[PDB]
Design a protein around this ligand. Sequence first.
Ligand SMILES: C[C@H](c1cnn(C)c1)n1cc(C(F)(F)F)cc(-c2cccc([C@]3(c4nncn4C)C[C@@H](C)C3)c2)c1=O
Ligand code: NA
Ligand SMILES: [Zn+2]
Ligand SMILES: [Zn+2]
Length: 384
Amino acid sequence: KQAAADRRTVEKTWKLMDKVVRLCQNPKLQLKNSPPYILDILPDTYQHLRLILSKYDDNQKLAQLSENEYFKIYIDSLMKKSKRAIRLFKEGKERMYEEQSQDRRNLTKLSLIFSHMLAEIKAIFPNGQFQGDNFRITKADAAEFWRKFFGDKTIVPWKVFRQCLHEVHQISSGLEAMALKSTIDLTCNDYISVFEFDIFTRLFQPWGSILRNWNFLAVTHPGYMAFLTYDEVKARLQKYSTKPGSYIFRLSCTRLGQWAIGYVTGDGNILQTIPHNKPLFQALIDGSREGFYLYPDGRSYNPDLTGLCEKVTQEQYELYCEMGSTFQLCKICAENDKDVKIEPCGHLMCTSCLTAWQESDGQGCPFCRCEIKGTEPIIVDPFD
Ligand SMILES: C[C@H](c1cnn(C)c1)n1cc(C(F)(F)F)cc(-c2cccc([C@]3(c4nncn4C)C[C@@H](C)C3)c2)c1=O
Ligand code: NA
Ligand SMILES: [Zn+2]
Ligand SMILES: [Zn+2]
Protein backbone atom coordinates (compact mmCIF):
# COMPACT_ATOMS: atom_id res chain seq x y z
CA LYS A 1 0.00 0.00 0.00
CA GLN A 2 1.62 3.23 -1.19
CA ALA A 3 0.75 6.78 -0.06
CA ALA A 4 -0.69 9.42 -2.49
CA ALA A 5 1.98 10.91 -4.77
CA ASP A 6 1.16 14.53 -4.02
CA ARG A 7 3.53 17.46 -4.73
CA ARG A 8 5.03 17.23 -1.20
CA THR A 9 5.97 13.55 -1.77
CA VAL A 10 7.43 14.21 -5.28
CA GLU A 11 9.59 17.03 -3.71
CA LYS A 12 10.86 14.65 -1.00
CA THR A 13 12.24 12.40 -3.81
CA TRP A 14 14.05 15.40 -5.36
CA LYS A 15 15.83 16.14 -2.07
CA LEU A 16 16.79 12.46 -1.67
CA MET A 17 18.08 12.31 -5.32
CA ASP A 18 20.07 15.52 -4.60
CA LYS A 19 21.81 13.80 -1.61
CA VAL A 20 22.59 10.76 -3.88
CA VAL A 21 24.07 13.04 -6.57
CA ARG A 22 26.33 14.82 -3.99
CA LEU A 23 27.51 11.45 -2.53
CA CYS A 24 28.29 10.30 -6.10
CA GLN A 25 30.17 13.58 -6.92
CA ASN A 26 32.91 12.57 -4.36
CA PRO A 27 36.18 12.33 -6.36
CA LYS A 28 37.41 9.49 -4.04
CA LEU A 29 34.85 7.28 -5.85
CA GLN A 30 36.76 7.62 -9.20
CA LEU A 31 33.32 7.25 -10.84
CA LYS A 32 33.40 6.60 -14.58
CA ASN A 33 31.22 8.75 -16.90
CA SER A 34 29.88 5.47 -18.43
CA PRO A 35 26.36 4.05 -18.64
CA PRO A 36 24.34 3.94 -16.53
CA TYR A 37 25.81 7.26 -15.28
CA ILE A 38 23.89 8.19 -12.12
CA LEU A 39 25.12 11.83 -12.33
CA ASP A 40 23.19 12.26 -15.63
CA ILE A 41 20.23 9.96 -14.74
CA LEU A 42 19.15 11.66 -11.49
CA PRO A 43 19.05 15.26 -12.87
CA ASP A 44 17.17 13.87 -15.96
CA THR A 45 14.70 12.13 -13.56
CA TYR A 46 14.16 15.44 -11.74
CA GLN A 47 13.59 17.23 -15.12
CA HIS A 48 10.98 14.60 -16.19
CA LEU A 49 9.20 14.93 -12.84
CA ARG A 50 9.11 18.71 -13.36
CA LEU A 51 7.68 18.19 -16.85
CA ILE A 52 4.93 15.96 -15.39
CA LEU A 53 4.07 18.59 -12.73
CA SER A 54 3.91 21.24 -15.51
CA LYS A 55 1.14 19.19 -17.28
CA TYR A 56 -0.92 18.59 -14.11
CA ASP A 57 -1.02 22.35 -13.53
CA ASP A 58 -4.10 22.74 -11.27
CA ASN A 59 -5.54 21.19 -8.06
CA GLN A 60 -7.92 18.82 -9.97
CA LYS A 61 -5.20 17.62 -12.37
CA LEU A 62 -2.86 17.17 -9.32
CA ALA A 63 -5.50 15.09 -7.53
CA GLN A 64 -5.86 12.78 -10.61
CA LEU A 65 -2.02 12.49 -10.68
CA SER A 66 -1.68 11.76 -6.91
CA GLU A 67 -4.01 8.72 -7.09
CA ASN A 68 -2.69 7.31 -10.42
CA GLU A 69 -1.78 3.69 -9.49
CA TYR A 70 1.44 3.57 -11.54
CA PHE A 71 2.59 7.05 -10.32
CA LYS A 72 2.13 6.11 -6.63
CA ILE A 73 4.26 2.98 -7.17
CA TYR A 74 6.83 4.96 -9.17
CA ILE A 75 7.23 7.74 -6.49
CA ASP A 76 7.33 5.20 -3.64
CA SER A 77 9.98 3.14 -5.57
CA LEU A 78 12.06 6.26 -6.42
CA MET A 79 11.97 7.27 -2.74
CA LYS A 80 13.03 3.79 -1.54
CA LYS A 81 15.86 3.44 -4.06
CA SER A 82 17.19 6.95 -3.28
CA LYS A 83 17.06 6.14 0.47
CA ARG A 84 18.81 2.82 -0.30
CA ALA A 85 21.64 4.60 -2.14
CA ILE A 86 22.11 7.00 0.83
CA ARG A 87 22.21 3.97 3.22
CA LEU A 88 24.73 2.22 0.96
CA PHE A 89 27.20 5.15 1.27
CA LYS A 90 26.55 5.41 5.06
CA GLU A 91 27.32 1.74 5.81
CA GLY A 92 29.82 1.26 2.98
CA LYS A 93 32.16 3.94 4.38
CA GLU A 94 35.64 3.41 2.74
CA ARG A 95 34.43 0.33 0.80
CA MET A 96 32.57 2.76 -1.55
CA TYR A 97 36.03 4.00 -2.65
CA GLU A 98 37.16 0.43 -3.65
CA GLU A 99 35.98 -0.31 -7.22
CA GLN A 100 35.75 -4.09 -6.60
CA SER A 101 33.77 -4.03 -3.30
CA GLN A 102 30.22 -5.45 -2.95
CA ASP A 103 29.13 -1.91 -1.89
CA ARG A 104 30.26 -0.47 -5.25
CA ARG A 105 28.63 -3.43 -7.05
CA ASN A 106 25.35 -2.52 -5.24
CA LEU A 107 25.80 1.13 -6.44
CA THR A 108 25.98 -0.26 -10.01
CA LYS A 109 22.78 -2.25 -9.34
CA LEU A 110 21.06 0.99 -8.16
CA SER A 111 22.42 2.97 -11.11
CA LEU A 112 20.89 0.35 -13.50
CA ILE A 113 17.54 0.61 -11.58
CA PHE A 114 17.50 4.45 -11.79
CA SER A 115 18.28 4.24 -15.53
CA HIS A 116 15.45 1.74 -16.14
CA MET A 117 13.09 3.92 -14.02
CA LEU A 118 13.90 6.96 -16.10
CA ALA A 119 13.22 5.09 -19.37
CA GLU A 120 9.98 3.73 -17.85
CA ILE A 121 8.61 7.13 -16.71
CA LYS A 122 9.45 8.67 -20.13
CA ALA A 123 7.52 5.88 -21.88
CA ILE A 124 4.52 6.00 -19.48
CA PHE A 125 4.39 9.79 -19.17
CA PRO A 126 5.72 10.89 -22.63
CA ASN A 127 6.06 14.69 -22.66
CA GLY A 128 4.81 14.63 -19.00
CA GLN A 129 1.35 13.20 -19.85
CA PHE A 130 -0.02 9.84 -18.63
CA GLN A 131 -0.36 7.40 -21.53
CA GLY A 132 -0.22 4.08 -19.61
CA ASP A 133 -3.73 3.05 -20.71
CA ASN A 134 -2.86 3.92 -24.35
CA PHE A 135 0.58 2.19 -24.14
CA ARG A 136 1.19 -0.03 -27.15
CA ILE A 137 3.08 -3.26 -26.42
CA THR A 138 5.27 -3.84 -29.48
CA LYS A 139 4.67 -7.58 -30.10
CA ALA A 140 0.90 -8.28 -30.75
CA ASP A 141 0.97 -11.81 -29.41
CA ALA A 142 2.58 -10.59 -26.15
CA ALA A 143 0.07 -7.69 -26.02
CA GLU A 144 -2.85 -10.17 -26.21
CA PHE A 145 -1.47 -12.00 -23.11
CA TRP A 146 -1.20 -8.71 -21.17
CA ARG A 147 -4.77 -7.73 -22.12
CA LYS A 148 -6.15 -11.22 -21.41
CA PHE A 149 -4.80 -11.40 -17.83
CA PHE A 150 -4.41 -7.76 -16.85
CA GLY A 151 -6.87 -5.79 -19.09
CA ASP A 152 -5.81 -2.11 -19.28
CA LYS A 153 -3.54 -2.24 -16.18
CA THR A 154 -0.36 -0.21 -16.58
CA ILE A 155 1.32 -2.18 -13.72
CA VAL A 156 0.62 -5.41 -11.83
CA PRO A 157 2.34 -7.10 -8.82
CA TRP A 158 5.07 -9.68 -9.68
CA LYS A 159 3.12 -12.35 -7.70
CA VAL A 160 0.06 -11.97 -10.08
CA PHE A 161 2.21 -11.58 -13.21
CA ARG A 162 4.24 -14.76 -12.54
CA GLN A 163 1.13 -16.84 -11.72
CA CYS A 164 -0.57 -15.66 -14.96
CA LEU A 165 2.59 -16.19 -17.07
CA HIS A 166 2.81 -19.78 -15.73
CA GLU A 167 -0.68 -20.37 -17.24
CA VAL A 168 0.83 -19.91 -20.73
CA HIS A 169 4.58 -20.64 -20.32
CA GLN A 170 5.43 -23.05 -17.49
CA ILE A 171 8.09 -21.98 -15.03
CA SER A 172 9.60 -25.18 -13.71
CA SER A 173 11.19 -23.98 -10.39
CA GLY A 174 11.52 -21.38 -7.61
CA LEU A 175 15.05 -20.56 -8.77
CA GLU A 176 13.80 -20.23 -12.40
CA ALA A 177 11.04 -17.79 -11.20
CA MET A 178 13.61 -15.83 -9.15
CA ALA A 179 15.92 -15.58 -12.24
CA LEU A 180 12.91 -14.54 -14.37
CA LYS A 181 11.89 -11.85 -11.80
CA SER A 182 15.34 -10.27 -11.96
CA THR A 183 15.01 -10.22 -15.78
CA ILE A 184 11.47 -8.70 -16.10
CA ASP A 185 11.36 -6.55 -12.93
CA LEU A 186 14.13 -4.21 -14.16
CA THR A 187 13.06 -1.45 -11.73
CA CYS A 188 13.35 -3.98 -8.80
CA ASN A 189 10.07 -2.81 -7.27
CA ASP A 190 8.17 -6.19 -7.13
CA TYR A 191 5.80 -4.98 -9.89
CA ILE A 192 5.75 -5.55 -13.61
CA SER A 193 4.82 -2.44 -15.63
CA VAL A 194 3.48 -2.70 -19.18
CA PHE A 195 6.81 -1.02 -20.19
CA GLU A 196 8.96 -3.72 -18.45
CA PHE A 197 6.72 -6.39 -20.12
CA ASP A 198 7.28 -4.66 -23.51
CA ILE A 199 11.10 -4.65 -22.97
CA PHE A 200 11.24 -8.32 -21.96
CA THR A 201 8.99 -9.49 -24.86
CA ARG A 202 11.00 -7.45 -27.39
CA LEU A 203 14.29 -8.93 -26.19
CA PHE A 204 13.21 -12.56 -26.05
CA GLN A 205 10.69 -12.73 -28.88
CA PRO A 206 8.96 -14.69 -30.35
CA TRP A 207 6.37 -14.87 -27.56
CA GLY A 208 5.42 -18.49 -28.48
CA SER A 209 8.69 -19.76 -27.01
CA ILE A 210 9.77 -16.80 -24.87
CA LEU A 211 10.97 -18.71 -21.76
CA ARG A 212 12.95 -21.18 -23.89
CA ASN A 213 14.47 -18.17 -25.75
CA TRP A 214 15.38 -16.48 -22.41
CA ASN A 215 16.79 -19.70 -20.86
CA PHE A 216 18.97 -20.45 -23.90
CA LEU A 217 19.99 -16.87 -24.89
CA ALA A 218 20.57 -15.32 -21.46
CA VAL A 219 20.69 -17.86 -18.61
CA THR A 220 23.10 -20.35 -20.16
CA HIS A 221 24.61 -18.71 -23.31
CA PRO A 222 28.37 -18.05 -23.07
CA GLY A 223 28.10 -15.06 -25.40
CA TYR A 224 25.57 -13.26 -23.18
CA MET A 225 27.05 -10.24 -21.31
CA ALA A 226 23.93 -8.60 -19.73
CA PHE A 227 24.40 -4.69 -19.45
CA LEU A 228 28.25 -5.00 -19.70
CA THR A 229 29.37 -1.71 -21.31
CA TYR A 230 30.53 -1.26 -24.92
CA ASP A 231 34.14 -0.51 -23.70
CA GLU A 232 34.25 -3.66 -21.62
CA VAL A 233 32.79 -5.76 -24.50
CA LYS A 234 35.41 -4.35 -26.91
CA ALA A 235 38.20 -4.96 -24.32
CA ARG A 236 36.84 -8.52 -23.83
CA LEU A 237 36.85 -9.26 -27.58
CA GLN A 238 40.35 -7.59 -27.93
CA LYS A 239 41.87 -10.76 -26.36
CA TYR A 240 40.30 -12.73 -29.33
CA SER A 241 41.27 -10.29 -32.14
CA THR A 242 43.24 -13.09 -33.89
CA LYS A 243 40.14 -15.36 -33.92
CA PRO A 244 37.65 -13.83 -36.41
CA GLY A 245 34.10 -14.80 -35.61
CA SER A 246 34.55 -14.42 -31.83
CA TYR A 247 31.43 -12.54 -30.64
CA ILE A 248 29.50 -11.44 -27.59
CA PHE A 249 26.04 -9.80 -27.19
CA ARG A 250 24.88 -7.29 -24.65
CA LEU A 251 21.80 -5.34 -23.58
CA SER A 252 22.07 -1.58 -23.95
CA CYS A 253 21.04 0.56 -20.97
CA THR A 254 20.50 3.59 -23.25
CA ARG A 255 18.52 1.56 -25.87
CA LEU A 256 16.23 -0.69 -23.73
CA GLY A 257 14.73 -3.55 -25.65
CA GLN A 258 17.62 -3.84 -28.12
CA TRP A 259 20.64 -6.09 -28.31
CA ALA A 260 24.12 -5.08 -29.53
CA ILE A 261 26.35 -7.87 -30.95
CA GLY A 262 30.10 -7.16 -30.84
CA TYR A 263 32.30 -9.34 -33.09
CA VAL A 264 35.83 -9.83 -34.46
CA THR A 265 36.12 -9.23 -38.25
CA GLY A 266 38.52 -11.02 -40.66
CA ASP A 267 40.99 -8.12 -40.42
CA GLY A 268 41.15 -8.23 -36.61
CA ASN A 269 38.81 -5.28 -35.98
CA ILE A 270 36.01 -5.31 -33.32
CA LEU A 271 32.74 -4.03 -34.74
CA GLN A 272 29.17 -4.09 -33.51
CA THR A 273 25.70 -4.38 -34.97
CA ILE A 274 22.23 -3.81 -33.54
CA PRO A 275 19.89 -6.53 -34.95
CA HIS A 276 16.41 -5.32 -36.13
CA ASN A 277 12.96 -6.08 -34.43
CA LYS A 278 13.54 -9.82 -34.86
CA PRO A 279 14.57 -12.86 -32.76
CA LEU A 280 18.17 -12.58 -31.47
CA PHE A 281 18.60 -16.34 -32.05
CA GLN A 282 17.71 -15.71 -35.75
CA ALA A 283 20.49 -13.04 -36.05
CA LEU A 284 22.84 -15.49 -34.26
CA ILE A 285 22.01 -18.56 -36.50
CA ASP A 286 22.19 -16.41 -39.68
CA GLY A 287 25.51 -14.90 -38.52
CA SER A 288 26.89 -18.36 -37.70
CA ARG A 289 26.18 -19.52 -41.27
CA GLU A 290 27.77 -16.40 -42.82
CA GLY A 291 30.93 -16.81 -40.69
CA PHE A 292 30.41 -13.72 -38.54
CA TYR A 293 29.36 -15.25 -35.21
CA LEU A 294 31.21 -18.50 -34.51
CA TYR A 295 32.93 -18.30 -31.13
CA PRO A 296 30.79 -16.96 -28.28
CA ASP A 297 33.17 -15.08 -25.93
CA GLY A 298 36.04 -16.63 -27.93
CA ARG A 299 34.94 -20.15 -26.92
CA SER A 300 35.33 -22.96 -29.45
CA TYR A 301 31.81 -24.25 -28.76
CA ASN A 302 28.94 -22.18 -30.19
CA PRO A 303 25.64 -23.55 -28.73
CA ASP A 304 23.21 -24.91 -31.37
CA LEU A 305 20.22 -22.51 -31.35
CA THR A 306 18.19 -24.12 -34.20
CA GLY A 307 15.99 -25.95 -31.62
CA LEU A 308 14.28 -22.58 -30.93
CA CYS A 309 12.96 -22.50 -34.56
CA GLU A 310 10.50 -25.41 -33.96
CA LYS A 311 17.59 -28.85 -18.68
CA VAL A 312 18.81 -25.55 -17.03
CA THR A 313 20.35 -26.55 -13.65
CA GLN A 314 19.55 -24.98 -10.24
CA GLU A 315 23.27 -23.97 -10.06
CA GLN A 316 22.93 -22.09 -13.43
CA TYR A 317 19.85 -20.16 -12.08
CA GLU A 318 21.73 -19.40 -8.82
CA LEU A 319 24.76 -17.94 -10.64
CA TYR A 320 22.44 -15.85 -13.00
CA CYS A 321 20.66 -14.39 -9.89
CA GLU A 322 23.92 -12.86 -8.45
CA MET A 323 23.57 -9.69 -10.55
CA GLY A 324 19.91 -9.18 -9.54
CA SER A 325 18.32 -7.82 -6.34
CA THR A 326 16.33 -10.90 -5.17
CA PHE A 327 18.11 -11.91 -1.92
CA GLN A 328 15.03 -10.60 0.00
CA LEU A 329 12.59 -12.89 -1.88
CA CYS A 330 11.63 -16.32 -0.53
CA LYS A 331 13.53 -18.92 -2.72
CA ILE A 332 10.85 -21.59 -2.29
CA CYS A 333 7.90 -19.67 -3.76
CA ALA A 334 9.62 -16.65 -5.40
CA GLU A 335 6.46 -14.60 -4.71
CA ASN A 336 6.57 -13.54 -1.02
CA ASP A 337 9.49 -11.76 0.66
CA LYS A 338 11.46 -13.55 3.38
CA ASP A 339 9.82 -12.76 6.72
CA VAL A 340 10.98 -15.61 9.02
CA LYS A 341 14.38 -16.84 10.25
CA ILE A 342 14.87 -20.44 11.38
CA GLU A 343 17.05 -21.06 14.45
CA PRO A 344 19.75 -22.25 14.89
CA CYS A 345 20.62 -22.65 11.15
CA GLY A 346 19.64 -19.08 10.23
CA HIS A 347 17.94 -19.94 6.89
CA LEU A 348 15.26 -17.43 5.69
CA MET A 349 11.93 -17.89 3.91
CA CYS A 350 8.33 -16.57 3.98
CA THR A 351 6.00 -17.80 6.75
CA SER A 352 3.55 -19.22 4.21
CA CYS A 353 6.25 -21.63 2.88
CA LEU A 354 7.49 -22.50 6.38
CA THR A 355 3.88 -23.32 7.41
CA ALA A 356 3.35 -25.52 4.33
CA TRP A 357 6.62 -27.34 5.10
CA GLN A 358 5.71 -27.88 8.80
CA GLU A 359 2.22 -29.11 7.85
CA SER A 360 3.79 -31.63 5.40
CA ASP A 361 5.79 -33.17 8.30
CA GLY A 362 8.95 -31.89 6.60
CA GLN A 363 11.96 -32.81 8.71
CA GLY A 364 13.66 -29.77 10.18
CA CYS A 365 14.59 -26.79 8.00
CA PRO A 366 13.38 -27.05 4.35
CA PHE A 367 16.88 -26.16 3.12
CA CYS A 368 19.33 -28.00 5.40
CA ARG A 369 17.05 -30.44 7.34
CA CYS A 370 18.60 -29.29 10.71
CA GLU A 371 16.15 -29.37 13.66
CA ILE A 372 14.01 -26.22 13.96
CA LYS A 373 14.68 -25.06 17.49
CA GLY A 374 12.76 -21.79 16.98
CA THR A 375 11.81 -18.99 14.58
CA GLU A 376 12.03 -15.20 14.55
CA PRO A 377 10.20 -12.66 12.35
CA ILE A 378 12.72 -10.76 10.18
CA ILE A 379 12.79 -8.11 7.38
CA VAL A 380 15.38 -8.61 4.61
CA ASP A 381 16.83 -6.12 2.15
CA PRO A 382 18.26 -7.30 -1.25
CA PHE A 383 21.80 -6.19 -0.28
CA ASP A 384 22.07 -8.32 2.94
C1 LIG B 1 27.47 -6.61 -16.31
C2 LIG B 1 26.54 -5.42 -16.08
C3 LIG B 1 27.30 -4.14 -15.90
C4 LIG B 1 26.86 -2.81 -15.89
N1 LIG B 1 27.86 -1.95 -15.70
N2 LIG B 1 28.96 -2.73 -15.59
C5 LIG B 1 30.26 -2.13 -15.36
C6 LIG B 1 28.67 -4.04 -15.70
N3 LIG B 1 25.72 -5.64 -14.84
C7 LIG B 1 26.28 -5.45 -13.59
C8 LIG B 1 25.58 -5.63 -12.45
C9 LIG B 1 26.23 -5.45 -11.12
F1 LIG B 1 26.01 -6.49 -10.30
F2 LIG B 1 25.79 -4.38 -10.48
F3 LIG B 1 27.56 -5.30 -11.23
C10 LIG B 1 24.23 -6.04 -12.53
C11 LIG B 1 23.65 -6.24 -13.73
C12 LIG B 1 22.23 -6.69 -13.77
C13 LIG B 1 21.33 -6.23 -12.81
C14 LIG B 1 20.01 -6.65 -12.83
C15 LIG B 1 19.58 -7.54 -13.80
C16 LIG B 1 20.46 -8.02 -14.76
C17 LIG B 1 19.98 -9.00 -15.84
C18 LIG B 1 20.91 -10.20 -15.71
N4 LIG B 1 21.73 -10.62 -16.65
N5 LIG B 1 22.40 -11.73 -16.15
C19 LIG B 1 21.96 -11.95 -14.94
N6 LIG B 1 21.03 -11.03 -14.62
C20 LIG B 1 20.31 -10.94 -13.35
C21 LIG B 1 19.94 -8.29 -17.23
C22 LIG B 1 18.44 -8.05 -16.94
C23 LIG B 1 17.49 -8.11 -18.14
C24 LIG B 1 18.46 -9.29 -16.00
C25 LIG B 1 21.79 -7.59 -14.74
C26 LIG B 1 24.40 -6.05 -14.99
O1 LIG B 1 23.94 -6.20 -16.11
NA1 NA C 1 9.27 -3.49 -11.81
ZN1 LIG D 1 7.87 -18.61 0.25
ZN1 LIG E 1 18.44 -24.47 7.58
